[PDB]
Each structure stands twice: as structure tokens, then as C-alpha cells.
Design a protein around this ligand. Structure first.
Ligand SMILES: [Mg+2]
Ligand SMILES: [Zn+2]
Lengths: 289, 132, 166, 108, 152, 148, 51, 297
């Protein structure tokens, strides 16, 4: 044997490293790891967002009905009466309803006075994207409300995560006026629109029909599509350029690999140019009025 | 998957001489059908120009033999036998090299049971037994 | 010495839910200390690799090697263990998923070369491993056709970006 | 002649795993019409050949029992007979070898 | 370069090859069925057919007597050859020495085979049977043969 | 070496500078030994500076575990979920204060090769270059050597 | 270059304590049952309280 | 009898088929054990233990080896041919048949019934939807005759044309597409009432169901299914449709004056994978099939 202690200990820690790396464990809630205290985490979540929450309404926002039912089932399978605190848990349903209603109406007001030319269906699809499950799940996971969420199924399936996120939006709506909550939903939802093209959120199907309906609304008669530039018609990697001429006047230009895809892309470009949502548009004026 | 197979694997004992006799009479009748080419529909016969090239044959080396000339010397000859020779297909001038047309010529007859599929389809559209 | 292949038959999975797939059977088996080289055994273990068990037994009953009879006996006892103990009901419903060979413990001898010199002859020994999975044998992966190659090339031409700026 | 550098495992794997050295799958194998013991085409089934070789060894054992020692080699044809099975009127001058068994249902 | 070169080289010379074929032929005449490797039984079949021809030549002929005295090394098989085998093949000309492969030898994995004289009071070999007449392809060809013979 | 290590692109975690800036650190887990010469600097730090650091930025939570250990450590968990653990074994008060300030400053993204240090998300304004930019059109789109 | 294998063992226990010793095995059961209770043929027919 | 799209008819036919199959499968409550025995030639004394009304004879072959799964086409349940995908009923004895057996005539009749059903499947889905096709029957022609037959009446607009070689080439390509999908001949023993309730429209098929239901005392008919195709046939079939390798429909013939409207006899020829022929023998057998085969009396 080689006598000594430090090398064997260091190799034992390295063996535990590789052994935990080969078989990773099922991940556990952060509230069940050793370094945890709920009240201080609530206070720090209130203070780090530069907001003044009332802590009782945040505690109201972070409970869920599934957590209440599982806690009551756990208290009944053991037979211990918890009718002292559990009858005043007061789940986050009404705060989530207030949050989703206020965030919907304020985001539609933002996107309406920001864009005077957008139709109601388009702004409806935009507010349905921004308040949809995916991006609020992203913002909720990167703003640590998932660590503060009290529920079952530790990955926190994104519907109840959306429930808690709009619940804390409603808690800010209760604790402070519409200006503060408007600034909050601006700073944490309108910034999610950055760098994304419009039809990456709306996802329309037939753009040319939408364009001819829009031009029938503006009393300009009919967009006829002329081929403008092409390079390679017989090869397997073509390039076309289709321009949409309304009354001998260009409105757009779209490239593509075939004439159908390039004409459809020119229809998308014309639709973005008409709706006032281009890459050349004014970036959002993040400031204080 | 698929096993290998040949023409007389699954025939019975009675059917093999009938099959051999049938295909032998069939391709002998096929070889005897093309015996009169000038009365069928021959291509137009042209006279000899000074710069022309005719087709050749395909023969079979039988053996060798001596042969004497009138002045007394001895020469040795090789007996080439043309068993069954038939022009097969005609490729025009613009389809091979753009310089000279080609003519395909087939050799001695072989069995249908030992050739490929595309060769059998080619000779079936032509109407001859396959060549070696 | 390490015997870990034999312990793989003593794994027990939790009982399945009704709304789940079948989770087909897995049977591990091996025979230790075979008087045979490991490379010549490896050629038979590569011959078997993907085929069904009956086709494997057919290809081994007519293969003229010393390892062929040994692998045929191992496959027969593995098939019998699969039918009896490991709850496989159809005997022909097995394919080889893993089959390989490892070097076993060896001995050493002299060679007595043609002067007062010598070499070190090694009496080689090897193992054989096999793993059977119930179900039909999975089909071989077909060679990728021209449209797949054109799709991959067009996708690579799609995925390029403006490099070394912004 | 000597090696100048040691061959790697990549060159060795490129040598000893190419399709010229691998064992080729054969497809000549089918089942025998009697007893189904996995014969090959163009080759007699090993089980049926073992049957007829065992019975031929038994008949040669009885023949060697009838012929005393070496160098007898009788000048008449032979027939074998099983239990029952009286000598037919064509088998008069032929030598009789009867072992003791039923006539099996492939030897006619 | 062995263009047109029959008689593969077997033993340690020509004489040992002919002695090996002589011993195999003596074993064939004695036991009426023999298992031996494939090239050896091929050569021994080729010799055994003309040995049966010399037996068919007759007993009183001294040349056939000399050939049978050379090729049979047990000297009791010569009355057998002239009085059993050659009267048995009086109608046939050359259809005998039926040769079939048997799978492999156990030890050195050599290609084995079995030849036998016809007649042969031993139990029969499991011969490869041609496919039956009642199968699908044969019945279709039988219909074609009958239809063409009716058409002729 | 860069080929032997992974890499990421430069990015903010959740678009900090556009709206409001948020402190990207959540927790600071101090384990200080009661007795032990290895943790004297952390001992003096917990005596004199951690209270002023906790009052300096109220977004972070600080835990002082006060556990018998031969190597004192500080565990920092960030907002996006990363965990960075560094040791304070045998350091002064100034080096420990500089370490915890540098932990409080940075965001939880991995310290790897930064790979093109600018992240414009709309890089073009006048229109990105395509080969038909700076190429004039001709009458009725006729290609070279065309007849009509 | 003169070495062979080791570990010749067997996998069948035997009756070694009666090969000889002065300690006998203290059992805690018996072989089978003494005399089998034969049930009545119609116990399912007599499944009630009595008959 | 009503107005019907051609798709919703085979939709309701397959849904009635699956309903009858679910009824037959739910008829038995549990898994009852039957002791099927093997009195074949190769493995004597073998006895399987099977599930009643569940286990096919393919599932009895799958205990033995793979060669029984590949080369057994038609089974023998105590006196009678059973197709390989029909669930057993009683405790019986079984024995398998192959193509290369001594007396394979039963499996030859079953194979030509299978090929006639495949020709019906390929013929009902290639015609114009404005035109009407009605499957009459499959005449059981003996196998010595040059081709198998299927009879189909056409629309009254179609009484004047005859198809060229290209239409028959399209028929053969669709038949090879049907062979390319490895589909099972799924069979069913259905009472004649619900059997005619499945069809209900094609009067020739109703007359055929009443014909084959007339001879047996229990009014039990034999239905089979290839994917979403449904047809009536007498007796058993081959297990898989990939057993066919060479397949080709020869020609059509008109046999008019027996009836005022027109019946057309489609003819074709096939051979399995296990007995495939060389190209010359195959074109000979194909050439004989162009002649008219008449065996109905
Ligand atoms: Mg030699
Ligand atoms: Zn056999």
C-alpha cells in the first residue's frame, strides 16, 4: 500500500463525481435542498424587481389548487387535522384571472397605439403569442417563480406555471396601480418581441388572399406579379425575384427557389410593408414618460 | 431472403425433356425464320464507293491444317467456321461518337437459361436466340 | 477476473401500466474459458450479429469452424433458458442484439527455437457473449437514396451564415 | 526485413474487418423433406445418412459374422431379410442375412 | 499451366497415387459402398467403371485376368468381379458408380463423398428427389404440353 | 485551447438592458468553520463585511452555515439556474470581498469562449447584401444573347 | 514459463458433518406431515354450517 | 340500396367487418386451453397448448421454428384445409403443408383462390368513378387450365372498347404494388344474415352469398379481407400476400350471348416465391394464358 490519506480521499471524491455523472438522479425542488428559507426568498423576489409587493398577496399568488388538494389528501391519508391554516390557503385563481385580463387589455393597447395599421386579428394573434404558454414559461423559469411555485409534479407543467405567472402579475395589479403593472409587463413581455419577424408569431396560411383583401380595403385594385430577376432556370438551385406591381408601381420584392415560393414571399413582404411591421420600423421606446 | 435458383430446380422428371425439346424447336424455328432477308424488308443496297467500310463477321477457330501452293511451298491455314452470325442492332452516326456509325454482330448460339434478364428481353424483342 | 454478464439476468423492472408498450424480453448469457483465439471467435460473432436465432443456427450448423459448434451450443442453451425461465413464449421469436468475444486468462510456454534461443508461446483462451431480444429481427437500414443525398446537400447549403461579421 | 513503425489499431481495423475477410452469409440451407433436420442443397442430409450408415454397419456386422474369418467373399449375390419376410422365389441362390428387426419404412 | 491435364496428383508420386486408388477400388469391390474424400472417389469412380468393363470382357480372357489380378489386392474379389458384378450389369453399359456428397469430415473438414455400385443389397441412400409432378409449375407445364399436343 | 473546449455566443439572459436591470444572483451559501486556521479570513468577513454587503444589494439572499469543515466554500446560484462554487480556503478579507463582489456582478452564463463579441439582432437596416444589389436591370429582363 | 490455472472447486454441497464430528445439526421442523387429513368429497356441497 | 360515395361504402363495410370481428372476439370471455397435437411427419409427438379462438396455426408454427413460419402455407385441422391465419376452435390435431409436398393440390386451389381475390382487389379500384363495376364471382377453375378467372360487369357505356397492352400493364403494376405491401389475408366466418347485410347492394354478390349459404345447414359463409378490400371466397387462402412473386393479368374476354348485358372475364397467372420460374418458361406460361379458359360445368 502507498501510505497516506489525501490522495485516496481525492480519488474517492472523483469516483463520486464520475458515478454521479454516469447515473444522474431525478432532480428535486429547490425548496427541498438544504439552503432554503421561504420568507426571505419572497422578500428578495419582491426587492430584486424594484417593486413594492405586499407579501400576503404574493403568498396568495404562489399557492395552486393542485397543491391544496394534494396537501389535503396528504393530511387525510395520515389522519392529522390541518383545519387551522389550510382553510385560509386561498388559491391564486382570481389573481390569475385579473392578471390575464389586465395583461391582455394592456398589451392590446400597447400594440394598438404602437401600430395603427395592424388589423384586429393580427394584434389578437400577437397578444396570444406573448401571453401564450411558451414565452411566459420561459420568462417564468428565468425569473425564478418556478422555484417559488408550490404545486405537484416538480417540472411544473407549463399551464400551472402560466397560472402562477399571471397570478403574480395580478398581485402587482392589486398592490400597485396600472402604471406600475404596465411598466412591468412592458419590461418583461414586450422585450420578448425583439428580433422576431411578424409572421414568426402570427403564422398565416394564404398570404396572397390576405394581400388582395387588404388592397381591396385600401381601394388599390389588383396586385399583379411580374418576375423581375432570375439566375439559373434549369439547375437544381435556382434563384428568382418576384415583384408585386400595383398599377405599374412596385410595392414589394420577394426571393425564393421557385416562382411560387418567391411570389408567396413577396406577398409576405408586401403584407409587412402595409401593416407597418418591418425590419426598418421604429424600435420600441423604452423610456420613462 | 431470396435463395439462388436455376431453370430446372422445380421441374419434375417428366417436364425436363419436354422443356428442352420445346425450346430447341422454338429457337431452331427462330433461326430458320430469318433465312430469307431479301424478301422480308431489306434496307436499300448501295454500290461501292472508294472510301467505304463494310461490316465483319464472328467466326470460331476450329483448328489448323497445311495447304500447298502451285509453286511447291507449304503454307499453314487456320480453319475459321462461322456458325451462326447475325447483325443485332444499328447505332446511327450521331449517337456513338459523331464520327462513324456502328453495327453490332453476334456470335455462336447459347442457352436462354444462362443469360441475364435485359439480354433476354433484348433478344426477345429482336427474335433470335442469344449469342455468346 | 470480473463476472458482470451473468448478473444481468437478475435485474427486475417494476410492473408496467396497461397504457404502455410491451417492453420485450432481454436474455444475457456467456460461456467462459473457451480454448480458441479471440479474433477467429470475433469473426463468427460478427457473422451472427443482427440475424434471427434460427437463421443464426442455420449459418452455424454449416460453418466449418471450431467456434461454430461452441456458439451453437451457447445459443441453444440460451434459447432454452429464454423459453423456460425468462417468460418468452415463442421459441423462434428471438434475434441476436449483442454478440461479441473477449480475451480470457492465458498461460505461457516455451518454443525452443533453433539455437540456444526461445520464444514465449501463449496458450490463448477467450470468452463468448450473447444477448437475445424477443420479437422479430429489425430490418437492415437501407442505403440512402439520391433524394436523401440531395436533401442533405440542400440543407447544408441552407444552414450557412455570414461568417466573421455581426 | 523488419517493420519500421508499429501499425496502429486504425490500420489493423481497416485490414481485418473489410468485406474480403468477413464470413459470407450462405443461403443454400433448407429443410429435409423427411425429419426436417436442416440439410444443405447438393449434399445428403446428415441425419438420414446417419440412419442408413448405422443400418449398413449392422448389416456388415451380420455379414462378417456369417463369413467366418477373412478371405471368403461369396460368389453369389446377397439380400437381407427382416423379421417375418420369407425368401421370395427369385431369391433362391442368393445368400440370406437376417438380423432381427422390423423392416423400416424407407428400405424397400 | 495445366490446360487439358486430367488425373490430379494425389500421393507421393504416380505409383503411390495408383496404389491409393487400388486400395480404394479393392475396398469398393469388397464392401459395395465407400466413404472417402471427394477427389479420391472421383478418380476411383473413373477407374471402377472400366474395371467393370474388363469384368464384362469375360472370365477366360487372360488380359482381363491380368487386370483383375493387378487391381484387386485380396484375390478373393476376382471370382466376385467375374461372377457377381459383371453378370449383374449385363444389360446396362455404363450407368453405375452413383456418387453423392456427404457433408464434411469431422476432424480436418475435408469434402467427403459416397460412391456405390448399383444393385447393392445395402439400404438405399437418401437420394435427392426431383420435385413432384403435382406441384404448381409442373401442372401448368403439363397443361401447356397437353394443349400443344392437342393443337398439333 | 478553443478546439478542446465548448463555446457559446454572446447574449443577455433575459434582455436586461432594454427594460429594467435585475441582479442575476439569487443565493450565497457561506460555510465557515468554527475553529480552523483555514477559514480565518471568512471568519473576519462574516464578522465585519457581510452585513454591509447584504444591505448593499437586497436582491441576493445570503446564508452563513457555520459548519465544521476543512475547506470553507461559497456557493452562488444564479437566476437562470447555473451553480458556481468557489473556495475561500486561506484568503484575506480583501480577496474574499473582491471575490463575492465579482460573483455578485456577473451573470450565470458559462465562462467559456465568447465567440464574436457582439450580438446585433437586426444587423441590417438598408437591406442585406444579395448578388443583385449593385446590378442594374435591363429592358424587359432580357438575358445576354437573347432574341426577344 | 511453467504455470497452470488454479481454483478447482465444486458446486454440490454434501453430507460432510456426518463424515465425522461431535456436533449434530439442531433442526427446527420435520420432513412432511404425519397423517393427511382427507377432506370430505362434498365439503363444497356441505359449505353451510352443518348437515 | 341507396346513393353512395365509393369511399363511404368500403368505410361502412370495414366498420361492419370490425364490428363482427369484435363480437366474435368478445364472445369468449376468458382464455381457455385447447390441446392441439402434431401428427405431421417431421416432429412427432409434439403437442402445443393454445388459447381457444385466439391462436392462429401461424402461432402454432412459431413455437417450432422459422422454417415453419416461412414454408407452411396451408394447415390440416383433422380432415380439412385451414388457412394459416384463422383461430382454432376445438382440441384437434394439426399438420402443415408446403408447396413442394407430394400432393399439394389443395394448396394450389387455395393459392389460385388467393390470386383471384387479389385480382378482384386490383380491379375494383382502377376504374373511373363515373363508371360502375360489380364483382360477380370467382369461378373455381382447375389449376391445369391456363389461367385463373374473375367475372366483372361494366357500365353500359363500356360495351364497345377493349383495353390495349398498356391498361393491362397498369393493372399489373397496381397488382405488384399490392404485393409490395406485406398484407395478411384476414379471414372471417360470418353468419349469412350479417354477411348479406355487409354487401346489401351488388345483387350478384347477394346471389352468391345465398348460393354458398344454401349448401351448408348453418348458413355460414367465408369472408376474407385484404386491407380495406372485402370479398367472398370458397374455402381457405394463403397467409400472406407477399408469397406471390411473379404476377401478371393476361387479358379480358367477352362472353356475351348468355345474357343481354355483358360479362367480362379477366384472366391472370401467378407463381409463388418458393417456385419461381426462369424468364423463358414464365413467358411461355404467360403466352398460354391469353387463350380463353372455359371451365364452369
Ligand atoms: Mg499432398
Ligand atoms: Zn433428413
Amino acid at each position: 500500500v502507498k501510505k497516506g490519506f489525501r490522495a485516496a480521499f481525492r480519488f474517492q471524491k472523483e469516483l463520486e463525481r464520475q458515478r454521479l455523472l454516469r447515473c444522474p438522479p431525478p432532480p428535486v425542488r429547490r425548496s427541498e435542498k438544504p439552503n432554503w428559507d421561504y420568507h426571505a426568498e419572497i422578500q428578495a423576489f419582491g426587492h430584486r424587481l424594484q417593486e413594492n409587493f405586499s407579501l400576503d398577496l404574493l403568498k396568495t399568488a404562489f399557492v395552486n389548487s393542485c397543491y391544496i388538494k394534494s396537501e389535503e389528501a396528504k393530511r387525510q391519508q395520515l389522519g392529522i387535522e390541518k383545519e387551522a391554516v389550510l382553510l385560509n390557503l386561498k388559491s391564486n385563481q382570481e389573481l390569475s384571472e385579473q392578471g390575464t385580463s389586465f395583461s391582455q387589455t394592456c398589451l392590446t393597447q400597447f400594440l394598438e397605439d404602437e401600430y395603427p395599421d395592424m388589423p384586429t386579428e393580427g394584434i389578437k394573434n400577437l397578444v396570444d403569442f406573448l401571453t401564450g404558454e411558451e414565452v411566459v414559461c420561459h420568462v417564468a423559469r428565468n425569473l425564478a417563480v418556478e422555484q417559488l411555485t408550490l404545486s405537484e409534479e416538480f417540472p411544473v407543467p407549463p399551464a400551472v406555471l402560466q397560472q402562477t405567472f399571471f397570478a403574480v402579475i395580478g398581485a402587482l395589479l392589486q398592490s400597485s396601480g396600472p402604471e406600475r403593472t404596465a411598466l412591468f409587463i412592458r419590461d418583461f413581455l414586450i422585450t420578448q418581441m425583439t428580433g422576431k419577424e411578424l409572421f414568426e408569431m402570427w403564422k398565416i396560411i394564404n398570404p396572397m388572399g390576405l394581400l388582395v383583401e387588404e388592397l381591396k380595403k385600401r381601394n388599390v385594385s389588383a396586385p399583379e406579379s411580374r418576375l423581375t430577376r432570375q439566375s439559373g432556370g434549369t439547375t437544381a438551385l435556382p434563384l428568382y425575384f418576384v415583384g408585386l406591381y400595383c398599377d405599374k408601381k412596385l410595392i414589394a420584392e420577394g426571393p425564393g427557389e421557385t416562382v411560387l415560393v418567391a411570389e408567396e414571399e413577396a406577398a409576405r413582404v408586401a403584407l409587412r410593408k402595409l401593416y407597418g411591421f418591418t425590419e426598418n420600423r421604429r424600435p420600441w421606446n423604452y423610456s420613462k414618460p | 431472403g431470396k435463395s439462388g435458383t436455376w431453370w430446372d430446380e422445380h421441374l419434375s422428371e417428366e417436364n425436363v425433356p419436354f422443356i428442352k425439346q420445346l425450346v430447341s424447336d422454338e429457337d431452331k424455328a427462330q433461326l430458320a425464320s430469318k433465312l430469307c432477308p431479301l424478301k422480308d424488308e431489306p434496307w436499300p443496297i448501295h454500290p461501292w464507293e472508294p472510301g467505304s467500310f463494310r461490316v465483319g463477321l464472328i467466326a470460331l477457330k476450329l483448328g489448323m491444317m497445311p495447304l500447298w501452293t502451285k509453286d511447291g511451298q507449304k503454307h499453314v491455314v487456320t480453319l475459321l467456321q462461322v456458325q451462326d452470325c447475325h447483325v443485332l442492332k444499328y447505332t446511327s452516326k450521331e449517337n456513338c461518337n459523331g464520327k462513324m456509325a456502328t453495327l453490332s454482330v453476334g456470335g455462336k448460339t447459347v442457352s436462354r437459361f444462362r443469360k441475364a434478364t435485359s439480354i433476354l428481353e433484348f433478344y426477345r424483342e429482336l427474335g433470335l436466340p442469344p449469342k455468346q | 477476473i470480473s463476472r458482470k454478464w451473468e448478473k444481468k439476468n437478475k435485474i427486475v423492472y417494476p410492473p408496467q401500466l396497461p397504457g404502455e408498450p410491451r417492453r420485450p424480453a432481454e436474455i444475457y448469457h456467456c460461456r467462459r474459458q473457451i480454448k480458441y483465439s479471440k479474433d477467429k471467435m470475433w469473426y463468427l460473432a460478427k457473422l451472427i450479429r443482427g440475424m434471427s436465432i434460427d437463421q443464426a443456427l442455420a449459418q452455424l450448423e454449416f460453418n466449418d469452424k471450431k467456434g461454430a459448434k461452441i456458439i451453437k451450443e451457447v445459443l441453444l442453451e440460451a434459447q432454452d433458458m429464454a423459453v423456460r425461465d425468462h417468460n418468452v413464449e415463442f421459441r423462434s421469436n428471438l434475434y441476436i442484439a449483442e454478440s461479441t468475444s473477449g480475451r480470457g486468462q492465458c498461460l505461457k510456454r516455451i518454443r525452443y527455437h533453433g539455437r540456444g534461443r526461445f520464444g514465449i508461446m501463449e496458450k490463448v483462451y477467450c470468452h463468448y457473449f450473447v444477448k437475445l431480444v424477443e420479437g422479430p429481427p429489425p430490418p437492415p437500414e437501407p442505403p440512402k437514396t439520391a433524394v436523401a443525398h440531395a436533401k442533405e446537400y440542400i440543407q447544408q447549403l441552407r444552414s450557412r451564415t455570414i461568417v466573421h461579421t455581426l | 526485413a523488419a517493420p519500421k513503425n508499429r501499425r496502429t489499431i486504425e490500420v489493423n481495423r481497416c485490414r481485418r474487418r473489410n468485406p474480403q475477410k468477413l464470413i459470407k452469409v450462405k443461403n443454400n440451407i433448407d429443410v429435409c423433406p423427411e425429419c426436417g433436420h436442416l440439410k444443405q442443397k447438393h449434399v445428403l442430409c446428415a441425419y438420414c445418412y446417419e440412419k442408413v450408415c448405422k443400418e449398413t454397419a449392422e448389416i456388415r456386422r451380420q455379414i462378417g459374422k456369417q463369413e467366418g474369418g477373412p478371405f471368403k467373399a461369396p460368389t453369389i449375390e446377397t439380400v437381407v431379410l427382416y423379421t417375418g419376410e420369407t425368401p421370395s422365389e427369385q431369391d433362391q441362390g442368393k445368400r440370406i442375412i437376417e438380423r432381427d428387426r422390423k423392416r423400416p419404412s424407407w428400405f424397400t | 499451366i495445366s490446360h487439358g491435364r486430367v488425373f490430379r496428383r494425389m500421393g507421393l508420386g504416380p505409383e503411390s497415387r495408383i496404389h491409393l486408388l487400388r486400395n480404394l477400388l479393392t475396398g469398393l469391390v469388397r464392401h459395395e459402398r465407400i466413404e472417402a474424400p471427394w477427389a479420391r472417389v472421383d478418380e476411383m469412380r473413373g477407374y471402377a467403371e472400366k474395371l467393370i468393363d474388363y469384368g464384362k470382357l469375360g472370365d477366360t480372357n487372360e488380359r482381363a485376368m491380368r487386370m483383375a489380378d493387378f487391381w484387386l489386392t485380396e484375390k478373393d474379389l476376382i471370382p466376385k468381379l467375374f461372377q457377381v458384378l459383371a453378370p449383374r450389369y449385363k444389360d446396362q453399359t455404363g450407368g453405375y458408380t452413383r456418387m453423392l456428397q456427404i457433408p464434411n469430415r469431422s476432424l480436418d473438414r475435408a469434402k467427403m463423398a459416397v460412391i456405390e455400385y448399383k444393385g447393392n443389397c445395402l439400404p438405399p441412400l437418401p437420394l435427392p428427389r426431383r420435385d413432384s409432378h403435382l406441384t404448381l409449375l409442373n401442372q401448368l407445364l403439363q397443361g401447356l404440353r397437353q394443349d400443344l399436343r392437342q393443337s398439333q | 485551447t478553443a478546439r478542446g473546449t465548448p463555446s457559446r455566443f454572446l447574449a443577455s439572459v433575459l434582455h436586461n438592458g432594454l427594460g429594467r436591470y435585475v441582479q442575476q444572483l439569487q443565493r450565497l451559501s457561506f460555510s465557515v468553520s468554527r475553529d480552523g486556521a483555514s477559514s480565518r479570513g471568512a471568519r473576519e468577513f462574516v464578522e465585519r463585511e457581510v452585513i454591509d454587503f447584504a444591505r448593499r444589494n437586497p436582491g441576493v439572499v445570503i446564508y452563513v452555515n457555520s459548519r465544521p469543515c476543512c475547506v470553507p466554500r461559497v456557493v452562488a446560484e444564479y437566476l437562470n439556474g447555473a451553480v458556481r462554487e468557489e473556495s475561500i480556503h486561506c484568503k484575506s478579507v480583501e480577496e474574499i470581498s473582491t471575490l463575492v463582489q465579482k460573483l455578485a456582478d456577473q451573470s450565470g452564463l458559462d465562462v467559456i469562449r465568447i465567440r464574436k463579441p457582439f450580438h446585433t439582432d437586426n444587423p441590417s437596416i438598408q437591406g442585406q447584401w444579395h448578388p443583385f444589389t449593385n446590378k442594374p436591370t435591363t429592358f424587359r429582363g432580357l438575358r445576354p444573347r437573347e432574341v426577344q | 514459463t511453467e504455470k497452470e490455472f488454479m481454483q478447482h472447486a465444486r458446486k454440490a454441497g454434501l453430507v460432510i458433518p456426518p463424515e465425522k464430528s461431535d456436533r449434530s445439526i439442531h433442526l427446527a421442523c420435520t420432513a412432511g406431515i404425519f397423517d393427511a387429513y382427507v377432506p370430505p368429497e362434498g365439503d363444497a356441497r356441505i359449505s353451510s354450517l352443518s348437515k | 340500396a341507396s346513393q353512395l360515395s365509393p369511399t363511404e361504402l368500403t368505410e361502412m363495410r370495414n366498420d361492419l367487418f370490425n364490428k363482427e370481428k369484435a363480437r366474435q372476439l368478445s364472445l369468449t370471455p376468458r382464455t381457455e386451453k385447447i390441446e392441439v397435437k402434431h401428427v405431421g411427419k417431421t416432429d412427432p409427438g409434439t403437442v402445443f397448448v393454445m388459447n381457444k379462438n385466439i391462436s392462429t396455426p401461424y402461432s402454432c408454427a412459431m413455437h417450432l421454428s422459422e422454417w415453419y413460419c416461412r414454408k407452411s402455407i396451408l394447415a390440416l385441422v383433422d380432415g380439412q384445409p385451414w388457412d394459416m391465419y384463422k383461430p382454432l376452435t376445438k382440441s384437434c390435431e394439426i399438420k402443415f403443408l408446403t408447396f413442394k409436398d407430394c400432393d399439394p393440390g389443395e394448396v394450389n386451389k387455395a393459392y389460385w383462390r388467393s390470386c383471384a381475390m387479389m385480382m378482384g382487389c386490383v380491379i375494383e379500384r382502377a376504374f373511373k368513378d363515373e363508371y360502375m363495376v360489380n364483382l360477380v364471382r370467382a369461378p373455381e377453375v382447375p389449376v391445369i387450365s391456363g389461367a385463373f378467372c374473375y367475372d366483372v360487369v361494366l357500365d353500359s357505356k363500356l360495351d364497345e372498347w377493349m383495353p390495349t397492352k398498356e391498361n393491362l400493364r397498369s393493372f399489373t403494376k397496381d397488382a405488384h404494388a399490392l404485393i409490395y405491401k406485406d398484407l395478411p389475408f384476414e379471414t372471417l366466418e360470418v353468419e349469412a344474415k350479417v354477411a348479406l347485410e355487409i354487401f346489401q347492394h351488388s345483387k350478384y354478390k347477394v346471389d352468391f352469398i345465398e348460393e354458398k349459404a344454401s349448401q351448408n345447414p348453418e348458413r355460414i359463409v367465408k369472408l376474407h379481407r385484404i386491407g380495406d378490400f372485402i370479398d367472398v371466397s370458397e374455402g381457405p387462402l394463403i397467409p400472406r400476400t407477399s408469397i406471390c412473386f411473379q404476377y401478371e393479368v393476361s387479358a379480358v374476354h367477352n362472353l356475351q350471348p348468355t345474357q343481354p348485358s355483358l360479362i367480362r372475364r379477366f384472366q391472370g397467372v401467378s407463381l409463388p416465391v418458393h417456385l419461381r420460374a426462369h424468364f423463358t418458361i414464365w413467358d411461355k406460361l404467360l403466352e398460354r394464358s391469353r387463350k380463353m379458359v372455359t371451365e364452369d360445368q
